[PDB]
Every structure is written in structure tokens, then in C-alpha cells.
């Protein structure tokens, strides 16, 4: 519980949730987001069995998540499932550092204090942020374990404060940002879905969404250090699971059925006596969003204000103050882990290439290059500076990840291996092949390209230590 | 020679060379027609060398091409062979019945004796010619075998019919269409791409043509029946396809530098002086061709008219009678080879459901029931009734039997198998590899679901076998 459920329920709940989440559920309509949360939460479940199924298997040592999984299903397969998993966590390093950057640049902002403009200075901040939590992480860990139930509390506070906000009356000026109470016509206009933008398909927002579902490996990290394992590491990440998708689908639907798609944000934009217009919700409260409506130049409103999460809520500092708590665990968690699986990886010498990034140095042999190494790709990935041109690849290299643990699960099933043999109540191989099999679909629906290096990435290192 | 060479000549000339080819060049521009035709090449040489190296190995016996692949990679990866080999050549049959079906249909129309209307004229033309050609298959060889030399005789005399038309200076009616002598504004015209309709991009044209590119296996089906295969079987293949690829560059050479793309067809629409508005290479030799540019309804031309390489002819009749020899052979040895591979496929018993399908019959057990299956997949594709839809599938279908005996190959010669050795000089372990490679990567180029579904009938097969 304290070290499961609590971890996974850190790690999984990030950047997605606070800025992206409403403009989701704007864009693709409240059933359809509904649809891809179950989706993504399906694929996640299976996932999450063949990794109760893996941590069950045996005893377990202290010796981490990629030594769990090497000692588990043999290093042919383990060696290229961990390269995978710390690419992916480092450019989720990337993400969730850019997610913080953002906030910090929208809080300048609004401060009236802009350093040259947004995309650099959303590279600077992205820049120090990552190079800031790197000498956090060199300093020590007990700082973060004090600070695990800080975060813990501020974002619980953040969740109360969004909730009482809604149940408030709307007041004048958030009236005039597009919000309002709880209303039968808002939930039946927002059910339909209504595509915008380049990336306005189902696909592409799935693709966006499904990094905010992944992290449930973090409550394996420390299975070595769990005094009883075999029952908290299951149990918790399945419940962790259960928690973060009943709070999409919650946040999901009161946004959805709380606020209209489009907003203006002018205060002296009423529905004067005598002539005036109706479009849409608005009219009927007094506003008249027509011509923001027709020159496409809305700048508020749920489907083109990303921060609208903050303006529905009481007091915004405390929304932001969670946004901080929750990028900032996500991303910490993520660059440990990816430290710790290079790491691990370069340890047991699977090719003389990586050996050179293996020499830790330290008093206590902390792994100084591996974190070099996840810093230098942060950094690289951070250039980009747009959330949701990082989102699919990640997205990208999660669901390899998970089809590649799902069908070596399966084929270990199936081909009966001498020392695998699981004692979870609750796996079955054919769920794990069906796993697999919708995973790689999706991968291939959502960018067929980076699905074909990523497969040939898989290939290429098998094949590498099947022929050597 | 007289049974490798001239067989691959022969199965490798079709359809496409004769109806589609100076569609393609008009569509795509010499440059990247060649590009197209040289790219199509390189992936058959490569499959060609590793198909010599294949028949070079070992002790050739009369099992046929099967057998020999069967025999020489094993059977894990010979039964999936087999059967995706099995029915691209069924499609195949199909593709050549269509384009017959097509010729007869025009030849109709000329006679002024349409039935119903062109599709179902076409269907019930193919299902007739294709079951005069079941009950031909099933009569005898001896009727084939002498009509072979007639098949090669037919299109020599196309091929000289149509180099003297072209030599010759054109004519009214052939200029009213839109054909003239060699000009070297028309080749400047024609050497630079035009894109028209749905599909008119580069990877589409490709998956069109490449079809026409196919057909090297034949010289291997009577491996067993030669009397020195090992000699002849490399030289043959590799002359086959010089000499093809030789043919298809002088072609599309030729006609984009003869003909224009747009045409108008009217007798009556020259450019009489002081009348009409002039635009196009035709007002140079006093033609107007400027109504059906604008309103894009021009019925001839190199861009809209398939038969135009009939009309550049002198003698049309000639062409006719080659398109008929070219289609009829590609089709009964498709069909033959589709049963033969069926049958022989089902008497090695590799799942006991494809056994009920493997009882032959008849005096001399002629494996009537492989026959039905081919003949009935044939109808089946023939019901659609599009060349440019039927083409994709088997390009398709190819691409990955090419794919899967390249990187078959390249495995046996990395892994070192023990009863694996090719005497064949010219192969070389990485060509094959990057075959596979380019082979794949054109496939998920061209259609991207189609890759997918055929990699996971592979991986089914070659995963129920090798869990079985
Ligand atoms: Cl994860
Ligand atoms: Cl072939
Ligand atoms: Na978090
Ligand atoms: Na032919």
C-alpha cells in the first residue's frame, strides 16, 4: 500500500490529467472518450495481470523491475524489453518536463513577465527544470520519500478544490470564460463528438491520452525491498488501476457536462435587450458567442483553453500547485527508473558497446553515466517543446513495450518453460495473446512507420543475440 | 533454354506489358517510370539469385518448386511458402483472366455487340474463359506444350508490329488520336510526372506494376525434368529477366516519346487558321486539343486511353493476337502452378484440415480437388472486375513470398545449417538480407493493412508449427 498503491497511483496520474484530459473530452465528445479510456484501461489490465503473473513467479530478489523480468522470462527477450522501457522513460522524462514547463511559462504570463517567447522559453525552463532534477536525484533519495505524501496531499487538495468549484454557481467572469452549472443541455451538445486541428481523429487523441494510463510498473521498482511482495505488488497495482480510471471517467464526464466548447472571455459580451443572437448554450444565459464562433478566434472555452481545469475551480493556485506535485513525481519516477534500467542493463554485459556507459563512480557507486545518459536524450527530446508532438511517440514505445511483455508472457505459457510457473489466480495465456495482439494493432493504427522501427528495433536486438 | 528461358519469358510477360504499362508512363513520367521499373528489378534479382542458389544446392529431384524449397529450408517455413505462393498464383490467374475478359469485352464493343453492360460483361467472360481453361488444364500438356512456341511466335510478331508502326510516319486518324512520330518536344514533355485520379502516386503505380515483374519461379517448377537444372536454371532466369526488363524500358521509352498524354479523337478538330483557341504540343502539327483538356473529358490519349499501344501499331489485329498469347499463358501456368503447389502442399500433411482438400482422383490421380479450390478463389477475385484492384493484392501477395524466401535464405546462411550449401558464386548473405529488408518496407509502403494481415497469417503459421 505504501509502496505500491500510493507509487503507482504517483506515477500514472501526470501531466495528461491537468491539461489535456478536458480538451480530450471536448474534442472527441464525452462516449468516445469514455470508449478509449476503457480501451487503454483494457490494455493496461492485461498488462497488469502478466505483470502480477511475473512478480508472483518465483522469489523474488532484490534486484529491480529489469531483474525481475530477465530472471523471469530469460535475457533474449529481456534485454530488448528493458531498452525499450528506458527509452520510453526518458523521453516521458521529456514529456513531463515540457508539461512543467508550460505551466511555469503560462504562470509568467500571467505575472506580465515573458523572458523572448512561449517556445523558448518553454525551452530554458525545460532546460534548468530537468538539469535541477538531475542534482536533486544525485543529492539523495530521502528528500523525495519525505516529499512522496506532500505530493500525495497536494493533489488531493487540487481534486477537492476542482469538485467544490463545480458545485459552486458559476460567477460572472468565469460566466464569461465559458463555464456554468450543471446543465442537461451542456451533457446532451457534449456528447457528439466534434474534430478539430490536425490531429483531431480518434487515433491521434488516443495516442495523446494513453501516456496518462501507463507508469504501472513503478510499483514493481522496489519489489525487493516489499517485506511481503507477492501479495502487495498485485493487489496494489490493480487497485491503483481501478482508482486512476473511476477518476478519468469522473473528470471526464462533470467536465464535459459543466462547461460549453466554445467561450469569447470579453465580460461586455452579453446578450443585450433588443437585438442580439443566439449561438449555441450561450444564448440562453445571456452571452452571445456567435462571432468568436464564426471567425474560428475563440481563445477560451473548453475545446481551445488548455488551463480550463483551473478557471472551473475555486482557487486556481491550489490546481497549480498540484499540476507541479504531479509533473514533478511523474518525472522523477521516470528518470530514476530509466537511470536504474540502464544501469541494471549495462551490468550484465549484454553487448560490449554499452559496457563503456557501465562504470558507476561515486562513494556509493551511484550509476552517474546512465544518468547522463537519460539526461542528455531529456534534453534532446525536450527541444521539441510541444506536448503533443511527444505524447504519440511515447505513446508509441509504451504499447511496444507492453506487447512485447505480454506475448513473452504468452510464449512462455504456452511453450511450458522448466522454471516459469506463476501462481496468480487470475492469468490466462489467451488474454495475454489478445493483449498482445490489440496492442500491436493499435501501435500500427496509430503511426505505422514508428511501429516498423520499433519492431525492427525488437528484431534487429533479438536476432543480434540469437545469432551471437 | 527451351525450358527455362523461354518459360520465364513467357509467364513474366502479361497483362500489364500490353493494357497498363503506357498508362503508367503517361501517369508517372519516363524518369520515375524507369526509377519504378529499376526498384521492381532490383527485388527480383535479388530473389533471383537466392532462387539459383537455392536450385544449385544439393541433389535437384523431381518434386518441383515445393518440393525443392521444401527440402532445401525446411518444411517450418516451406508450408507457409507454399501456400502464400499457392495464392498469389490463384489471384494471379484471376488478374490474367480479367485482362482477357477486358480485350474480348473491347473487341465487342468494336463490334457494335455489347450484351448488358461492361462489368457484367466482363465477369461473365471471365468465368467462361476460366472454366474453357479449367477443362483445357484437365484435358492434357501435349496441347500447351506444342502451343507454346505458337504464344512466343504471337507476341514476337506484336512486338515487330508494333516497333514498324511506330517507325512509320502517322497517319490522320492515328494524329486525331493523339499520335505522332518521334519528337523530342514530346519527350520533354513526358520525362516529368503528371498525377491524375485516386490512385496516381508513385506507390500505387508501383503496386500496379510490379505484377508484371513476377513470374520468375516458373523456370524452377520443372526443376526436376531438366536434365542439367543446376546450369540451366541460374542463366535462364537471369537472361529471362534482363531481357524482360530490357523490353519494359524500350517500351515505356519508346511510347512517352511518341504519343501525348491528352487526345481528343475527333476528326473534324483541326486547327483551322483565324479559329480556335490554342494550347498543347498539338497546335504545333494543327491540332486543337484545348476543349476536353478544360473540361477534362478527353476519351484518348496516352493518359485515358488503355489500347493505345494497338493504335500506334500498324496492324491492330497482331496486337490483339499477342495480348491473347500473353494472358493465356500467364494464366494456365499460373493456374497450373496454383494447383501443383496446393496439391503437393496437402500430400506432405502439414494440419489435418487442408487433408480432406489433398485426395486426388481420376485415372492418372490428377489432383482434381486443388484444381476446384484455385479455380474457385479465381472466380471469386474475377468478380470484382478491376484490374487496378485485383493488381495490389498480388503485389501484395508476391512481396511477401519474395520476403519470406530472402530472409529464409539469409537465416540458413547465417545460423550455418548443416544441410545447407549453395554452389552458387553470385549469392552473398547481406544482398538477400536487404532484399527482405527493401521487400518489407515496400509492402508497408504500398498498403499497410494488407502487410499487417499478411505477416500475421505468417506468424500463425509459422507459430502453429512450431508450437506443434
Ligand atoms: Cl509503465
Ligand atoms: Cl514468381
Ligand atoms: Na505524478
Ligand atoms: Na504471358
Same mark, same amino acid.
Given at each position: 500500500?505504501?509502496?505500491?498503491?500510493?507509487?503507482?497511483?504517483?506515477?500514472? &496520474?501526470?501531466?495528461?490529467?491537468?491539461?489535456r484530459? !478536458?480538451?480530450?473530452?471536448?474534442?472527441?465528445?464525452? =462516449?468516445?472518450? &469514455?470508449?478509449?479510456?476503457?480501451?487503454?484501461?483494457?490494455?493496461?489490465? *492485461?498488462?497488469?495481470?502478466?505483470?502480477?503473473?511475473?512478480?508472483?513467479?518465483?522469489?523474488?530478489?532484490?534486484?529491480?523491475?529489469?531483474?525481475?523480468?530477465? $530472471?523471469?522470462?530469460?535475457?533474449?527477450?529481456?534485454?530488448?524489453?528493458?531498452?525499450?522501457? /528506458?527509452?520510453?522513460? /526518458?523521453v516521458?522524462?521529456?514529456?513531463?518536463?515540457?508539461?512543467?514547463?508550460?505551466?511555469?511559462?503560462?504562470?509568467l504570463?500571467?505575472?506580465?513577465?515573458? *523572458?523572448?517567447?512561449?517556445?523558448?522559453?518553454?525551452?530554458?525552463?525545460?532546460?534548468?527544470?530537468?538539469?535541477?532534477?538531475?542534482?536533486?536525484?544525485?543529492?539523495?533519495?530521502?528528500?523525495?520519500?519525505?516529499?512522496?505524501?506532500?505530493?500525495?496531499?497536494?493533489?488531493?487538495?487540487?481534486?477537492?478544490?476542482?469538485?467544490?468549484?463545480?458545485?459552486? !454557481?458559476?460567477?460572472?467572469?468565469?460566466?464569461?470564460?465559458?463555464?456554468?452549472?450543471? $446543465?442537461?443541455?451542456?451533457?446532451?451538445?457534449?456528447?457528439?463528438?466534434?474534430?478539430?486541428? !490536425?490531429?483531431?481523429?480518434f487515433?491521434?487523441?488516443?495516442?495523446?491520452?494513453?501516456?496518462? /494510463?501507463?507508469?504501472?510498473?513503478?510499483g514493481?521498482?522496489?519489489?525487493?525491498?516489499?517485506?511481503?511482495?507477492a501479495?502487495?505488488?498485485?493487489?496494489? @497495482?490493480?487497485?491503483?488501476?481501478?482508482? @486512476?480510471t473511476?477518476?478519468?471517467?469522473?473528470?471526464?464526464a462533470?467536465?464535459?457536462?459543466?462547461?460549453?466548447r466554445?467561450?469569447?472571455?470579453?465580460?461586455?459580451?452579453?446578450?443585450?435587450?433588443?437585438?442580439?443572437?443566439? %449561438?449555441?448554450?450561450?444564448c440562453?444565459?445571456?452571452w452571445?458567442?456567435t462571432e468568436?464562433?464564426?471567425?474560428?478566434?475563440?481563445?477560451?472555452?473548453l475545446?481551445?483553453?488548455?488551463?480550463?481545469?483551473?478557471?472551473?475551480?475555486?482557487?486556481?493556485? #491550489?490546481?497549480?500547485?498540484?499540476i507541479f506535485?504531479?509533473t514533478?513525481?511523474?518525472?522523477?519516477?521516470?528518470?530514476?527508473?530509466? /537511470?536504474?534500467?540502464?544501469?541494471?542493463?549495462?551490468?550484465?554485459?549484454?553487448?560490449?558497446?554499452?559496457?563503456?556507459?557501465?562504470?558507476?563512480?561515486?562513494?556509493?557507486?551511484?550509476?552517474? $553515466?546512465?544518468?547522463?545518459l537519460?539526461?542528455?536524450?531529456?534534453?534532446?527530446?525536450?527541444?521539441?517543446? %510541444?506536448?503533443?508532438?511527444?505524447? !504519440?511517440?511515447?505513446?508509441?514505445?509504451?504499447?511496444?513495450?507492453?506487447?512485447?511483455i505480454?506475448?513473452?508472457?504468452?510464449?512462455?505459457?504456452i511453450?511450458?518453460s522448466?522454471?516459469? $510457473?506463476?501462481?496468480?489466480?487470475?492469468?490466462?495465456?489467451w488474454?495475454?495473446?489478445?493483449?498482445?495482439?490489440?496492442?500491436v =494493432?493499435?501501435?500500427?493504427? #496509430?503511426?505505422?512507420?514508428?511501429?516498423?522501427?520499433?519492431?525492427?528495433?525488437? #528484431?534487429?536486438?533479438?536476432?543480434?543475440?540469437?545469432?551471437?
Amino acid at each position: 500500500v505504501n509502496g505500491v498503491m500510493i507509487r503507482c497511483m504517483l506515477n500514472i &496520474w501526470g501531466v495528461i490529467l491537468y491539461l489535456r484530459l !478536458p480538451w480530450i473530452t471536448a474534442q472527441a465528445g464525452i =462516449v468516445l472518450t &469514455w470508449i478509449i479510456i476503457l480501451l487503454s484501461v483494457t490494455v493496461t489490465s *492485461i498488462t497488469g495481470l502478466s505483470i502480477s503473473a511475473i512478480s508472483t513467479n518465483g522469489k523474488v530478489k532484490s534486484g529491480g523491475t529489469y531483474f525481475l523480468i530477465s $530472471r523471469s522470462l530469460g535475457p533474449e527477450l529481456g534485454g530488448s524489453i528493458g531498452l525499450i522501457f /528506458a527509452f520510453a522513460n /526518458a523521453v516521458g522524462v521529456a514529456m513531463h518536463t515540457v508539461g512543467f514547463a508550460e505551466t511555469v511559462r503560462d504562470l509568467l504570463q500571467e505575472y506580465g513577465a515573458p *523572458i523572448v517567447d512561449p517556445i523558448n522559453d518553454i525551452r530554458i525552463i525545460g532546460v534548468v527544470s530537468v538539469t535541477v532534477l538531475l542534482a536533486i536525484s544525485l543529492a539523495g533519495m530521502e528528500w523525495e520519500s519525505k516529499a512522496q505524501v506532500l505530493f500525495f496531499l497536494v493533489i488531493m487538495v487540487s481534486f477537492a478544490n476542482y469538485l467544490v468549484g463545480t458545485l459552486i !454557481p458559476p460567477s460572472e467572469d468565469k460566466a464569461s470564460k465559458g463555464f456554468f452549472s450543471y $446543465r442537461a443541455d451542456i451533457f446532451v451538445q457534449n456528447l457528439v463528438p466534434d474534430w478539430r486541428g !490536425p490531429d483531431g481523429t480518434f487515433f491521434g487523441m488516443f495516442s495523446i491520452f494513453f501516456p496518462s /494510463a501507463t507508469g504501472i510498473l513503478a510499483g514493481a521498482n522496489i519489489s525487493g525491498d516489499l517485506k511481503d511482495p507477492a501479495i502487495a505488488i498485485p493487489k496494489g @497495482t490493480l487497485m491503483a488501476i481501478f482508482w @486512476t480510471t473511476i477518476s478519468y471517467l469522473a473528470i471526464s464526464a462533470t467536465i464535459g457536462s459543466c462547461v460549453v466548447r466554445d467561450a469569447s472571455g470579453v465580460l461586455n459580451d452579453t446578450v443585450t435587450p433588443g437585438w442580439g443572437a443566439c %449561438e449555441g448554450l450561450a444564448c440562453s444565459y445571456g452571452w452571445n458567442f456567435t462571432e468568436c464562433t464564426q471567425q474560428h478566434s475563440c481563445h477560451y472555452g473548453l475545446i481551445n483553453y488548455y488551463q480550463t481545469m483551473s478557471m472551473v475551480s475555486g482557487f486556481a493556485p #491550489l490546481i497549480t500547485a498540484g499540476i507541479f506535485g504531479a509533473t514533478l513525481s511523474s518525472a522523477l519516477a521516470c528518470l530514476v527508473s530509466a /537511470a536504474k534500467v540502464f544501469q541494471c542493463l549495462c551490468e550484465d554485459q549484454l553487448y560490449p558497446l554499452i559496457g563503456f556507459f557501465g562504470k558507476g563512480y561515486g562513494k556509493n557507486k551511484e550509476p552517474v $553515466r546512465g544518468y547522463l545518459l537519460a539526461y542528455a536524450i531529456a534534453v534532446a527530446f525536450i527541444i521539441i517543446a %510541444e506536448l503533443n508532438t511527444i505524447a !504519440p511517440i511515447i505513446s508509441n514505445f509504451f504499447l511496444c513495450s507492453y506487447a512485447l511483455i505480454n506475448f513473452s508472457c504468452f510464449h512462455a505459457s504456452i511453450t511450458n518453460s522448466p522454471g516459469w $510457473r506463476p501462481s496468480f489466480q487470475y492469468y490466462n495465456k489467451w488474454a495475454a495473446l489478445f493483449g498482445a495482439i490489440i496492442s500491436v =494493432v493499435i501501435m500500427f493504427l #496509430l503511426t505505422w512507420w514508428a511501429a516498423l522501427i520499433a519492431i525492427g528495433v525488437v #528484431l534487429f536486438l533479438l536476432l543480434y543475440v540469437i545469432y551471437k
